């Protein structure tokens, strides 16, 4: 998925906010890796929605 930078720290077990709560949520008993990179070079245009 594509998220805002302030939300990257929210993609983790046990976290709450406007994401990982009534949004994509990981299990607490989670095995795996969350891999992320800055996509601004593709998404720098003023797309809005």
């Amino acid at each position: 998925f594509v998220i805002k930078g302030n939300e990257v720290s929210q993609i983790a077990p046990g976290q709450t906010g406007n994401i990982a709560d009534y949004n994509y949520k990981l299990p607490d008993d989670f095995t795996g890796c969350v891999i992320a990179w800055n996509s601004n070079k593709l998404d720098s245009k003023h797309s809005g929605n």
């Binding site: 077990p13 046990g14 709450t16 607490d28 008993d29």
Partner: protein, 49 residues
């Protein structure tokens, strides 16, 4: 405080010690008695019985 039980901090203390070493001065809360000598007795010397 909002995380589930598996993600809360736990304080861990590990007490490591070898038991078959000849000298030891670390502990022993039992009371000593008179050493009888020259007579069949049940003895306990620094944990060795």
């Amino acid at each position: 405080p909002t995380y589930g039980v598996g993600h809360q901090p736990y304080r861990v203390v590990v007490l490591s010690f070898e038991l078959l070493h000849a000298p030891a001065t670390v502990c022993g809360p039992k009371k000593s008695t008179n050493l009888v000598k020259n007579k069949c007795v049940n003895f306990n010397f620094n944990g060795l019985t």
